[PDB]
Amino acid sequence: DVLMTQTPLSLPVSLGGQASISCRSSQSVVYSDGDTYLEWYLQKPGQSPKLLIYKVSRRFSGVPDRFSGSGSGTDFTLKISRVETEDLGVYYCFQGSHVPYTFGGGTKLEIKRTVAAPSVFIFPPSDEQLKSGTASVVCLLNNFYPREAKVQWKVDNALQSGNSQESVTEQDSKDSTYSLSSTLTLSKADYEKHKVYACEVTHQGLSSPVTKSFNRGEC
Amino acid sequence: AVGIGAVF
Amino acid sequence: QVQLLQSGAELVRPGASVTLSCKASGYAFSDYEIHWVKQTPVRGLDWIGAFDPKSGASASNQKVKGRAILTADKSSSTAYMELRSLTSEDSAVYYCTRLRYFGYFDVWGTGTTVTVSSASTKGPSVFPLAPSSKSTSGGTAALGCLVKDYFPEPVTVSWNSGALTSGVHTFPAVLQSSGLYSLSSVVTVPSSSLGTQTYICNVNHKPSNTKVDKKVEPKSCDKGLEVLFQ
Numbered sequence: 001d002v003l004m005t006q007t008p009l010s011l012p013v014s015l016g017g018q019a020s021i022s023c024r025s026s027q028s029v030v031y032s033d034g035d036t037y038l039e040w041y042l043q044k045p046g047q048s049p050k051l052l053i054y055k056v057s058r059r060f061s062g063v064p065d066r067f068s069g070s071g072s073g074t075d076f077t078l079k080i081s082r083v084e085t086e087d088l089g090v091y092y093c094f095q096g097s098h099v100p101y102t103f104g105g106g107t108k109l110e111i112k113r114t115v116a117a118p119s120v121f122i123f124p125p126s127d128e129q130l131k132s133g134t135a136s137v138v139c140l141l142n143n144f145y146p147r148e149a150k151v152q153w154k155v156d157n158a159l160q161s162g163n164s165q166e167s168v169t170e171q172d173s174k175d176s177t178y179s180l181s182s183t184l185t186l187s188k189a190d191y192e193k194h195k196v197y198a199c200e201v202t203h204q205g206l207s208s209p210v211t212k213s214f215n216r217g218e219c
Numbered sequence: 220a221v222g223i224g225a226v227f
Numbered sequence: 228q229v230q231l232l233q234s235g236a237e238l239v240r241p242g243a244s245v246t247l248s249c250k251a252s253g254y255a256f257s258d259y260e261i262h263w264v265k266q267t268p269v270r271g272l273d274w275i276g277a278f279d280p281k282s283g284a285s286a287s288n289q290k291v292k293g294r295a296i297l298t299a300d301k302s303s304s305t306a307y308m309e310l311r312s313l314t315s316e317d318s319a320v321y322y323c324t325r326l327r328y329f330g331y332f333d334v335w336g337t338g339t340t341v342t343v344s345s346a347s348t349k350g351p352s353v354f355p356l357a358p359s360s361k362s363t364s365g366g367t368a369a370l371g372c373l374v375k376d377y378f379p380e381p382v383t384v385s386w387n388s389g390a391l392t393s394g395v396h397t398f399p400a401v402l403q404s405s406g407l408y409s410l411s412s413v414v415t416v417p418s419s420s421l422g423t424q425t426y427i428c429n430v431n432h433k434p435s436n437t438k439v440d441k442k443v444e445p446k447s448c449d450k451g452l453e454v455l456f457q
Contacts, residue, residue: 021314031221035329039331039393041272043266043272046291046339047357048322049264049324049332050335051332054331060331092272094220094274094328094332095220096331097220098290099223099286100276100286100287101262101274101277102274103271106271119369121364121413122361122362123356123357126355126356126357130355130357136354138356138373138411140369142369142415144412154456164400165401165409167312167398167399167400167410167411168398173260177414179396183409196455197455207222215452215454216450219360219361219446219447219448219449220262220324221329221378222279222329223284223285223286224281224283226284226331227282227284
């Protein structure tokens with residue numbers, strides 16, 4: 001009913017830099033008591049939302065000086081100065097002046113840091129899983145930046161397609177890297193039909209693509 | 220926020 | 228020690244109802260309203276409604292009107308939200324949070340993952356991702372646990388009953404074509420610790436009451452038999 005429109009949807013910022021998030025209410029959010037109950041909340045990956053700013057510019061206890069809120073009436077702005085890795089998350093404005101209370105749509109902070117090449121690890125299927133009739137081969141790309149990365153599977157040196165799923169973590173709160181898993185799933189029959197399994201990884205931080213590989217029965 | 224009960 | 232306790236997860240059929248509970252402690256229950264906030268990846272945070280135990284008033288947002296009933300039991304310090312005629316649009320994490328008049332949302336529950344689905348609950352299979360030279364690079368070894376074919380979300384994974392947190396990555400679950408979820412949890416450790424430290428992953432899938440502690444043991448590789456393409 002009172003509509004809160006937050007911009008931008010995603011905000012790249014270099015570490016140690018300054019980020020600016022803006023939020024505009026469709027109507028005034030000054031309450032009859034004179035105050036403006038405009039709050040900024042942060043939701044970090046895997047956690048509950050947490051309060052940063054209340055009453056456009058006042059800082060919840062424990063919230064560093066680097067976070068400062070401002071604005072008036074229709075237009076509000078949260079400023080993060082000297083951004084640190086821990087500031088990663090989705091920032092939301094919120095009006096608590098007129099029922100029904102409403103959140104902005106959120107701004108996902110994206111921290112820019114130096115290039116970091118992935119460490120690459122490969123895991124053959126466990127004997128226990130092989131008893132079950134399926135084989136999962138896991139390739140792990142650990143702690144890399146930036147996020148773009150290419151992972152290709154080769155079985156007996158033949159490129160694979162359609163039989164792998166990958167998943168990527170959020171930016172790490174301590175070092176702003178990503179990690180990625182790529183899981184090649186095969187029937188046990190298909191797995192026992194071939195010998196060589198290889199994960200090939202291309203990433204900007206690597207002078208050339210890295211391949212990790214093993215033989216069925218080796219480990 | 221104000222609270223839905225604050226005016227009572 | 229103010230806290231708000233919510234159940235971790237509820238699987239509910241489409242067209243049925245769910246009852247969410249928020250059990251407060253560490254403060255005087257009547258001095259704070261309880262508000263309900265729906266979280267999803269794309270639609271963000273969504274103020275659902277509120278109940279004030281002092282005045283007894285309630286309110287809810289326009290979209291959920293007619294389907295949401297907010298109440299509270301002061302004697303047992305517990306607020307409730309009942310939501311009826313559920314569809315998959317209602318699948319989300321629902322948080323409760325507290326609010327003193329003219330205050331702010333300073334304390335939050337940890338959220339109830341509600342999944343609206345007609346599929347049944349299924350506990351996971353847990354398989355080791357054994358450390359070996361193929362998962363060692365330099366002085367760092369990687370190891371983990373594959374948590375396969377469970378429904379619904381979420382699952383928790385800890386390492387060594389929570390004593391091991393540094394270097395842990397638990398990946399987002401992926402919905403397989405089977406309709407079941409799978410996830411991996413990995414951790415990097417010093418490779419010299421492989422011969423001397425025991426590593427256990429603690430997997431907990433509460434919706435199915437499945438608790439698994441899997442010891443992940445190192446494996447030796449016989450590099451002599453390896454055939455390579457380079």
